[PDB]
């Protein structure tokens, strides 16, 4: 199967020069020997080979110390159904460019009930296990469905009713911790973010959070008030957008859009193409031979 994957000659050179540096210092596990993973790290440090190597070796040590390589089999997150009741979030369909759409209903987060049913450390380990599923299953499924290389998501954060007066220091610190793990270990995986239903109460929440965010991440974020539905329908087809966000989707047979995990990673023919299929990238295939 032929997937649209344009490589720039200048990027092909830089990534191979980075790969040769990693091999010569035994910093390249075969699991991470992928043109596109290395390209994301190089982009995160503006193709500075020395800063990217330091970022890379920090990530290798992090995967070792965290237990990231074995998290699917090791981490049984038994409180998942209770957590999801007090923090509604999920992937739901694809945007018009084939990227997965990730939604969080932050207006419906119950922080007190959430700390009754999990811990911050367990929630973060669940975040890492879901990220591993996103980069190994969900993004490659989107590559197949669109016949195009995809490795980043469109995020919608619904912040209805969220105001600065109820924006707590533990809420801030979780955002910091989640972003630190994402920026260190999953770089360049956010394409864009739409923050919707922001009230006048939200202006100081966004002010204070931007002080802690990677400034490249800030440039990918759009904060919208109550009139958001047409902006989401411009970039996401109505069939892929839940009806509560202005689309047609109800996922009624699966108990609703925030629980269905709807997307091409649920299709058995696409998942067979991942397990059976030869590499999604021609440069990896040519390095192998
Ligand atoms: C009602 C209680 C507080 C509600 C939440 C506060 C409002 C948050 C406002 C702004 C957040 C802006 C963050 C921008 C950076 C996120 C970048 C990003 O890509 O992350 C995406 C998801 O977005 C986030 O990570 C957003 C941050 C999540 C955390 C939100 C805070 C939850 C608060 C719970 C409090 C628990 C502790 C309470 C103890 C009493 C996923 O990436 P991808 O699409 O690539 O898979
Ligand atoms: Cl589906
Ligand atoms: Ni749905
Ligand atoms: Ni490629």
């Amino acid at each position: 199967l032929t997937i649209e994957d344009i490589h720039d000659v200048e990027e092909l050179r830089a990534v191979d020069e980075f790969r040769n540096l990693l091999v010569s210092e035994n910093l390249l596990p075969p699991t991470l020997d992928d043109y596109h993973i290395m390209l994301r790290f190089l982009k995160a440090r503006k193709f500075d080979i020395g800063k990217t190597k330091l970022m890379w070796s920090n990530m290798i040590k992090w995967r070792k110390d965290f237990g990231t390589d074995t998290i699917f089999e090791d981490f049984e997150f038994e409180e998942f159904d209770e957590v999801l009741k007090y923090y509604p979030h999920g992937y739901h369909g694809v945007d018009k460019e084939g990227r997965p759409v990730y939604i969080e209903r932050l207006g419906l987060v119950d922080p007190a009930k959430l700390m009754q049913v999990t811990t911050v450390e367990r929630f973060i380990r669940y975040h890492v296990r879901e990220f591993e599923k996103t980069v190994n299953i969900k993004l490659p499924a989107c590559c197949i469905a669109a016949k195009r290389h995809i490795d980043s998501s469109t995020t919608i954060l619904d912040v209805q009713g969220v105001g600065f007066k109820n924006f707590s220091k533990p809420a801030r610190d979780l955002i910091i911790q989640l972003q630190k793990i994402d920026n260190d270990n999953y770089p360049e995986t956010l394409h864009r973010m739409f923050i919707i239903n922001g009230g006048s109460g939200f202006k100081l929440v966004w002010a204070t959070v931007k002080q802690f965010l990677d400034p490249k991440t800030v440039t990918k974020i759009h904060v919208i008030g109550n009139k958001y539905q047409n902006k989401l329908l411009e970039i996401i087809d109505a069939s892929q957008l839940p009806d509560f966000l202005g689309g047609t989707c109800t996922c009624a047979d699966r108990g609703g859009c925030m629980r269905s995990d709807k997307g091409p990673w649920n299709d058995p023919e696409i998942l067979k193409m991942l397990q059976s299929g030869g590499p999604l990238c021609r440069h990896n295939s040519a390095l192998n031979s």
Side-chain angles (χ1 to χ4, degrees), residues 12-156:
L12 286 168
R13 292 172 61 184
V15 175
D16 271 356
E17 280 165 355
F18 180 59
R19 182 179 182 278
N20 296 335
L21 182 55
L22 292 188
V23 161
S24 73
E25 299 187 0
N26 279 111
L27 299 171
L28 185 54
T31 183
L32 297 173
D33 186 9
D34 178 7
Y35 178 81
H36 288 288
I37 306 170
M38 288 183 281
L39 181 53
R40 289 192 283 105
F41 281 85
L42 278 164
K43 286 176 172 192
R45 295 299 181 262
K46 295 176 167 192
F47 290 93
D48 185 330
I49 197 170
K51 291 181 171 182
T52 311
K53 185 172 72 78
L54 174 60
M55 187 187 182
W56 188 268
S57 65
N58 287 347
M59 171 275 296
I60 296 302
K61 179 196 195 315
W62 174 82
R63 296 186 69 86
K64 189 181 195 279
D65 292 347
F66 203 78
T68 309
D69 290 325
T70 54
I71 199 168
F72 292 112
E73 57 271 34
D74 291 350
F75 190 58
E76 188 160 358
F77 186 63
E78 75 277 1
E79 61 268 47
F80 169 78
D81 302 294
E82 296 297 324
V83 166
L84 197 67
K85 185 186 297 180
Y86 305 121
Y87 194 146
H89 65 281
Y91 287 92
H92 188 272
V94 295
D95 67 14
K96 293 184 179 173
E97 288 165 341
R99 299 184 205 89
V101 172
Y102 180 66
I103 303 163
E104 296 203 349
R105 288 177 75 63
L106 291 181
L108 299 186
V109 165
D110 197 338
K113 292 287 289 176
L114 186 66
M115 285 305 111
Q116 292 178 10
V117 296
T118 192
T119 68
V120 166
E121 180 176 6
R122 284 180 62 78
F123 188 79
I124 282 172
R125 180 162 290 276
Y126 155 70
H127 169 94
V128 168
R129 194 183 63 183
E130 281 305 307
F131 232 118
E132 288 296 298
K133 291 189 193 169
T134 297
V135 306
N136 293 122
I137 306 171
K138 292 188 174 72
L139 289 161
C142 290
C143 292
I144 296 178
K147 285 186 282 169
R148 192 175 86 69
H149 175 71
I150 305 300
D151 59 12
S152 67
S153 299
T154 292
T155 300
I156 303 163

Side-chain angles (χ1 to χ4, degrees), residues 92 242 249-251 256-257 260 262:
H92 188 272
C249 199
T250 69
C251 288
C257 295
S260 60
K262 168 184 192 196

Side-chain angles (χ1 to χ4, degrees), residues 228 238 241-250 257:
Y228 67 70
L241 188 70
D243 59 355
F244 58 80
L245 298 184
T248 54
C249 199
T250 69
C257 295

Side-chain angles (χ1 to χ4, degrees), residues 148-183:
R148 192 175 86 69
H149 175 71
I150 305 300
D151 59 12
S152 67
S153 299
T154 292
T155 300
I156 303 163
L157 301 184
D158 173 23
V159 296
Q160 176 63 247
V162 180
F164 189 55
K165 295 155 208 315
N166 301 126
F167 180 56
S168 76
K169 198 177 163 197
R172 195 198 68 184
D173 293 345
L174 182 59
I175 295 170
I176 291 176
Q177 275 181 291
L178 289 173
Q179 285 292 101
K180 176 67 151 66
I181 287 171
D182 294 348
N183 293 341

